[PDB]
Design a protein around this nucleic acid. Structure first.
Ligand SMILES: [K+]
Ligand SMILES: [K+]
Ligand SMILES: [K+]
Ligand SMILES: [K+]
Ligand SMILES: [K+]
Ligand SMILES: [Mg+2]
Ligand SMILES: [Mg+2]
Ligand SMILES: [Mg+2]
Ligand SMILES: [Mg+2]
Ligand SMILES: [Mg+2]
Ligand SMILES: [Mg+2]
Ligand SMILES: [Mg+2]
Ligand SMILES: [Mg+2]
Ligand SMILES: [Mg+2]
Ligand SMILES: [Mg+2]
Ligand SMILES: [Mg+2]
Ligand SMILES: [Mg+2]
Ligand SMILES: [Mg+2]
Ligand SMILES: [Mg+2]
Ligand SMILES: [Mg+2]
Ligand SMILES: [Mg+2]
Ligand SMILES: [Mg+2]
Ligand SMILES: [Mg+2]
Ligand SMILES: [Mg+2]
Ligand SMILES: [Mg+2]
Ligand SMILES: [Mg+2]
Ligand SMILES: [Mg+2]
Ligand SMILES: [Mg+2]
Ligand SMILES: [Mg+2]
Lengths: 319, 341, 102, 158, 74, 120
RNA sequence: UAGGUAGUAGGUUUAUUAAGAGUUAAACCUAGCCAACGAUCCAUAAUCGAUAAUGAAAGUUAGAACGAUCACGUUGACUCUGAAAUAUAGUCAAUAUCUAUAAGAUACAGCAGUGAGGAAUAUUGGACAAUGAUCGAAAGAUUGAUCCAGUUACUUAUUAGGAUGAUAUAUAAAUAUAUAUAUAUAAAUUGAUUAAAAAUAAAAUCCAUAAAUAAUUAAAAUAAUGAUAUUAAUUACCAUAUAUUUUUAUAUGGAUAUAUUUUAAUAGUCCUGACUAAUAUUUGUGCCAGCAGUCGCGGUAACACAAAGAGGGC
């Protein structure tokens, strides 16, 4: 059983009464004006508790369930204000106990209905400089900085790349006042990352889950036979999971173990370049039976899965 | 793309990837997706309706069906068994729409470089977005781990900032601001003691959420906190604004205005050449949507971001930012697996 | 490339346009007997000046020949046999041997 | 289509690669021994058994394999000019250069192919012996008695 | 129920239902026949297409016009 | 080009975006018919160089994939390359100046970069 | 379709061929050979893929497009040349047409195009610039192969505008920085009298890009040659220098009146009783008119017919 259902607020609100014939109002519109509060002459909603951004590193995410739709508070004292019979805003009769002791997890949860979505922690401008100076000057490896500050190696590598862009921008006076104002505002809206805080630290043991292993194989062995991760790896014909983690930590450009030389074994010829020639020929050795465009290959151009790519200039090209 | 029609309808109450005021009320009043009493088809349809409204509404159904991938990606923490704390179940089905997160337009929205996915598309199409230094003008460009993308600073400020008022609109706000200032100078001069007493009591309830108290302490150092009759006398009355006289003449208007907070510039038009409200202030209702992604590292000073990885599901968490719970995404996944059968 | 020097056989553009042939003497007003124009104007300029596809390509080929000291004498385009193309020669010949020699 | 899965999901085909040497060479000792080996008889035999007349007008035995001598192939196909002829002419010089390059290429092709074939037989022989040794080692580990085997009930005597 | 006997260009003679309110089909009128039976009429296994050949579209049809050969009103 | 066995380009790709297979083919078979062998690929459109790269001195590169050993074999048995394939093989250093013609003979043109064989 | 076969099954020899064999021809012998696991006969059909469609898969379907193979070039047979042809050749005959009336020529299943048939499938286009093919010592010539464009939503893909936005006036002393601005007055489209909406929808405001305009200009191709072509792309007075992932920024030479081209945004179609997503109601019709994939709907409160409002798909 299903029918169309107008999305009325789940919480109680003041419905429309008898209306003058020319108002032509809706119960949805009046519920929104009650959520928003009065609009001043400047076009602002100062009474709504979400109109202005937080400035204390604590996100102000909507909590309709805990406040039962009461979104109005005094713009300076931050004291709850509710609608009364007179049509004015005043103190609530009873304090809301659900809004005074909120769990730590909920504070970082932006969407009431999804507790698996949480905001990330912003890194302070100091930790970023420390990470930048350790990888670049002191010459530490990304694996070391990752294991020290509790940050995943890709994030560590990204911080170095971004701090380099901020130096060039600051070296050419490209960071304007507005950009500085915006950056600081956004910094004071998110919980700052604390390398010492154990819970704030990012897990460093995560590996991609393969597909062949996703199945459930079971072995019946002797009651006192030892079976461990290495034995399981042999059964599943995969490298041990610890080895996978170690190989994934040596991928960072500044990480230890980064190596790429086994491929430098392909004969290449650069054709002679003569004055007046607009391009150079590069020849790459290949093998008959592998090189070439195959004959009778599937044409997908008229199919929904037609292959679309992008060239070096960023232009959309058919592959 | 699909034409944008009735995206912020209150009766439908669909939640969109935007910071719009009407879209905040729809999210505020939703109270979850109702799946009770519905047949399996009705449950699946409802889940599809809600999820697609948020995740890639601009994509046509047939295009989305092609893009949709049955394979979802999770990670295995190899230390869980070495902790001892109660393990949490991985929300695998919150990865149903993860394939969209690698799109350039979605990446811009998650980085807070645009106020909505729709705006992100227009920023990309108009030539304001670069990936790895190359200008990309196709919203459907897919990012790979490690890619860096940037947006022209003026566009990001226009998306995260307040709207620029027009000259006529901002000239009526200054008229009212002058009237309400001359009322504060007439109440300060008629009974200075009460006004100062009220002024001191207001600064006690600031809570430090209002930085005006910190600035006020400076002002008390610019002149024990005891009354001073020189204050009321110092206060002066601003001159009224004749909207008609200074109509169509901004330089004249911005020379007749001199308020203690707004001096020689019309409200919100300190630099009429800039494309946003000046001096720059955050857009209204930004806090409820300001979510920092786990899969991007953002540098707001330069408007640069790096695509760290494709969002993944882990015990107790999904990096795919969604306003809907796992049961809804599970139904949505069930629908698309079978092409809506 | 560079501007070759006028010779005794080809003193000016008008002589050049007459030796190459293929009705290229009808472009003498396009060039205006300017030696440099003949050896500087590329296809794009000639197309803007109204030279048709076949003639402008032919001129540029003969300009390259002259620049390399290769003969610029007219070479004629092919023509079908007097008795017609091979596919229509049997029919044509049969009707030409019954109206000339009977 | 589904058929592509059998070929690495490669769509379309390539022409069959030609063989530079169309027959086994005289240096492929392994093949030479196999053909010389006496042909089996009986249930899994090949050929006419002693006393069984073959069809009249037919050859009792199979034609002998033609083994290529790469030295003789090179001598007959790309023989060198017998005299150092006087190539004063421009066209003679061009032809001499082209003939020299063509001869160099085809001689390198025949000798690289023969080497590849011989090197491939040796690599297979080494690889097979390794695999055989590894299988014996693996099997020996399987047959090794562990302490857990004590908990497996047995009736060896019966 | 309005029907019509029709001789198809392949020599088969069929009975086709004429849908819609009102029709201008007569004898010798050129009609185009599609599949689809008239459930309550036994032996009428086909439909004539409105707005094709000599059969006009339903007069004054407002809804589902494409199914009745009615063009869009300006 | 003469002979029954020719090395020539077979056209692939889409309208306005030609790509080519370098093939050994019977002279009489269709240009795009399945050949005797596919020796390589030729992409005629040079890779575009950025404004900075241009001033930096980067030259656009046309990319050819080729089986050097197999190509030499087919030249050895008398396969005859087309004019375009001949130019490619002379630039690769497989063929020499004996295959040049009077029209393309670069007898006097300065060499800015000499053929370089590397490993990559 | 139950019996079929009579060079038929096998043996021997000659002829013929580069070559085996009742493959063809000649001779002489044996009585065999095929068949209810389907012979013989009849009907139908070009075959297939690392191609397309579908499915979890085994499979099933197609055989247009890409590619491989076969056959044919109005019909039949025969011969010549040749390594290879019962050749799109030649010979004779058949059918049709034509003009030169000859033991004549032609046969569009080459391209374009026309009539016919059909529910239904396009230009009597451009160029040999590219890749090939033929001829030539070369210069070069030829090429409806081929490359391009035209026609056609037949298929696929991208784009086809974002942020803000529920009213308008009057209103208010005569710079330690204010601040929950507050009052009146008028206006307020369809539906409806409250969970009944249409509706942030519209207008309006802010900011853009496309196109245009201007300059510039690759690449397909080079020794030279560009059909496509009014090229793509880029830049917004043009040029230059310096610094300057990108990019940015400064300053310069010339260029206009301290500033510097202009500037947008009108979707259709089906459906809302159940299967099956569609609750805001209302009018006409009255087992009629009509609807219908299935169950069924319609006899005066029709959620199903015909419509308005509202709503759901794509
Ligand atoms: K899909
Ligand atoms: K049968
Ligand atoms: K066809
Ligand atoms: K050509
Ligand atoms: K619609
Ligand atoms: Mg329903
Ligand atoms: Mg020749
Ligand atoms: Mg015989
Ligand atoms: Mg026979
Ligand atoms: Mg006989
Ligand atoms: Mg047939
Ligand atoms: Mg089949
Ligand atoms: Mg078939
Ligand atoms: Mg066809
Ligand atoms: Mg034939
Ligand atoms: Mg025939
Ligand atoms: Mg014939
Ligand atoms: Mg015909
Ligand atoms: Mg035709
Ligand atoms: Mg017809
Ligand atoms: Mg032509
Ligand atoms: Mg009314
Ligand atoms: Mg433009
Ligand atoms: Mg050119
Ligand atoms: Mg209907
Ligand atoms: Mg009624
Ligand atoms: Mg229905
Ligand atoms: Mg109806
Ligand atoms: Mg309607």
């Amino acid at each position: 059983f299903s029918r169309r259902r107008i999305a009325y607020p789940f919480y109680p609100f003041k419905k429309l009464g008898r209306q003058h014939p020319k108002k032509h109002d809706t119960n949805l519109k009046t519920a929104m004006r009650q959520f928003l509060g009065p609009k001043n002459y400047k076009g602002e909603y100062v009474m709504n508790k979400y109109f202005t951004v937080p400035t204390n590193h604590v996100p102000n995410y909507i909590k309709p369930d805990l406040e039962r739709g009461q979104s109005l508070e005094h713009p300076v004292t931050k004291k709850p204000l509710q609608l009364r019979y007179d049509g004015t805003l005043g103190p609530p009769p009873v304090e809301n106990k659900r809004l005074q002791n909120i769990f730590k997890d909920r504070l970082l949860q932006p969407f009431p209905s999804n507790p698996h979505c949480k905001t990330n922690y912003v890194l302070s401008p100091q930790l970023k400089q420390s990470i930048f100076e350790e990888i670049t000057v002191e010459g530490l490896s990304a694996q070391q900085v990752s294991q020290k500050y509790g940050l995943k190696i890709p994030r560590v590598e990204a911080i170095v790349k971004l701090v380099s862009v901020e130096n060039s921008w600051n070296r050419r006076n490209r960071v304007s006042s507005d950009l500085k104002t915006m950056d600081e505002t956004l910094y004071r809206m998110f919980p700052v990352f604390d390398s010492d805080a154990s819970f704030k630290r990012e897990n460093l043991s995560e590996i991609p889950v393969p597909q062949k292993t996703l199945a459930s194989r079971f072995l019946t062995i002797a009651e006192s036979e030892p079976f461990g991760p290495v034995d399981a790896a042999h059964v599943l014909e995969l490298e041990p999971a610890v080895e996978t983690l170690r190989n994934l930590s040596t991928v960072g450009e500044h990480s230890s173990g980064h190596q790429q030389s086994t491929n430098k074994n392909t004969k290449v010829i650069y054709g002679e370049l003569v004055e007046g020639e607009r391009s150079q020929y590069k020849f790459t050795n290949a093998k008959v039976g592998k090189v070439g465009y195959r004959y009778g290959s599937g044409n997908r151009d008229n199919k929904k899965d037609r292959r679309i790519g992008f060239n070096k200039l960023g232009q959309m090209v058919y592959i | 793309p699909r034409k944008a029609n009735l995206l912020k309808s209150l009766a439908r109450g669909r939640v969109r990837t935007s910071f719009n005021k009407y879209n905040l009320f729809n999210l505020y009043k939703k109270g979850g997706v109702d799946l009770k009493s519905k047949s399996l088809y009705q449950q699946k349809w409802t889940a599809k309706q809600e999820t697609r409204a948020y995740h890639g509404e601009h994509l046509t159904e047939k295009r989305w069906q092609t893009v949709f991938k049955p394979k979802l990606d999770s990670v295995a923490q190899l230390d869980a068994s070495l902790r001892g704390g109660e393990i949490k179940e991985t929300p695998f089905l919150l990865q149903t729409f993860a394939v969209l997160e690698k799109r350039l337009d979605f990446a811009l929205f998650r980085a807070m470089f645009a106020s909505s996915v729709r705006q992100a598309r227009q920023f990309i199409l108009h030539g304001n977005v670069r990936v790895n230094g190359v200008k990309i003008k196709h919203p459907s460009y897919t990012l790979k781990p490690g890619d860096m993308f940037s947006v022209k600073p003026d566009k990001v400020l226009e998306a995260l900032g307040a709207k620029k008022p027009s000259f006529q609109e901002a000239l009526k706000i200054d008229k009212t601001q002058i009237v309400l200032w001359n009322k504060y100078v007439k109440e300060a001069k008629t009974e200075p003691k009460e006004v100062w007493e009220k002024k001191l009591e207001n600064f006690e309830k600031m809570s430090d959420s209002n930085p005006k108290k910190l600035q006020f302490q400076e002002f008390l150092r610019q002149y024990s906190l005891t009354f001073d009759p020189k204050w009321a006398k110092n206060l002066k009355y601003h001159d009224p604004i004749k909207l008609s006289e200074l109509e169509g003449d901004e330089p004249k208007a911005r020379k007749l205005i001199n308020l203690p907070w707004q001096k020689n510039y019309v409200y919100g038009r300190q630099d009429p050449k800039k494309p946003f409200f000046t001096p720059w202030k955050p857009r209204p209702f930004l806090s409820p949507f300001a979510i920092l992604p786990h899969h991007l590292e953002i540098s707001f000073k330069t408007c640069h971001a790096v695509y760290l990885r494709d969002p993944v599901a882990r015990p107790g968490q999904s990096e795919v930012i969604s306003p809907f719970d796992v049961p809804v995404h599970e139904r949505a996944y069930m629908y698309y697996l079978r092409n809506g059968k | 490339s560079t501007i070759p020097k006028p010779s005794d056989q080809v003193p000016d553009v008008d002589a050049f346009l007459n030796k190459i042939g293929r009705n290229c003497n009808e472009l003498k007003d396009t060039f205006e007997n300017n030696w440099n124009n003949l050896f500087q104007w590329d296809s794009k300029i000639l197309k803007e000046k109204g030279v048709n596809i076949q003639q402008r390509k032919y001129i540029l080929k003969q300009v390259h020949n002259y620049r390399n000291n290769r003969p610029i004498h007219e070479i004629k385009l092919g023509k079908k046999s007097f008795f017609g193309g091979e596919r229509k020669r049997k029919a044509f010949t049969a009707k030409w041997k019954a109206e000339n020699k009977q | 289509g589904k058929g592509a899965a059998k070929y690495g999901f490669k769509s379309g085909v390539f022409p069959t690669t030609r063989s530079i040497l169309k027959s086994p060479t005289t240096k492929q000792t392994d093949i030479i021994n196999k053909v010389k080996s006496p042909k089996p008889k009986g249930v899994l035999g090949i050929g006419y058994a002693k006393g069984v007349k073959h069809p009249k007008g037919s050859h009792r035995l199979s034609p002998k394999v033609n083994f290529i001598d790469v030295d003789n192939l090179i001598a007959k196909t790309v023989a060198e000019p017998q005299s150092i002829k006087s190539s004063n002419g421009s066209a003679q010089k061009v032809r001499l250069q082209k003939a020299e390059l063509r001869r160099k290429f085809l001689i390198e092709a025949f000798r690289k192919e023969e080497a590849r074939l011989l090197h491939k037989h040796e690599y297979l022989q080494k690889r097979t012996k390794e695999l055989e040794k590894a299988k014996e080692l693996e099997l020996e580990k399987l047959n090794k008695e562990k302490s857990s085997d004590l908990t497996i009930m047995t009736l060896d005597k019966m | 129920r309005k029907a019509c006997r029709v001789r198809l260009t392949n020599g088969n003679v069929v009975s086709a239902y004429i849908p819609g309110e009102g029709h201008d089909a007569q004898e010798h009128s050129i009609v185009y026949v599609r599949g689809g039976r008239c459930q309550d009429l036994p032996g009428v296994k086909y439909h004539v297409i409105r707005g094709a050949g000599d059969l006009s579209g339903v007069v004054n049809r407002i809804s589902s016009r494409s199914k009745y050969g009615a063009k869009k009103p300006s | 080009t003469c002979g029954l066995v020719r090395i020539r380009l077979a056209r692939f790709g889409r309208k306005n975006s030609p790509v080519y297979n370098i093939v050994v083919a019977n002279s009489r078979k269709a240009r795009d018919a399945k050949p005797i062998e596919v020796l390589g690929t030729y992409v005629p459109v040079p890779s575009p160089v950025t404004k900075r790269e241009l001033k930096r001195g980067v030259v656009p590169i046309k990319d050819v994939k080729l089986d050097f050993d197999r190509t030499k074999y087919w030249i050895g048995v008398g396969a005859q390359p087309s004019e375009t394939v001949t130019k490619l093989l002379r630039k690769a250093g497989i063929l020499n100046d004996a295959w040049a013609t009077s029209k393309n003979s670069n007898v006097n043109r300065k060499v800015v970069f000499e053929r370089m064989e590397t490993l990559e």
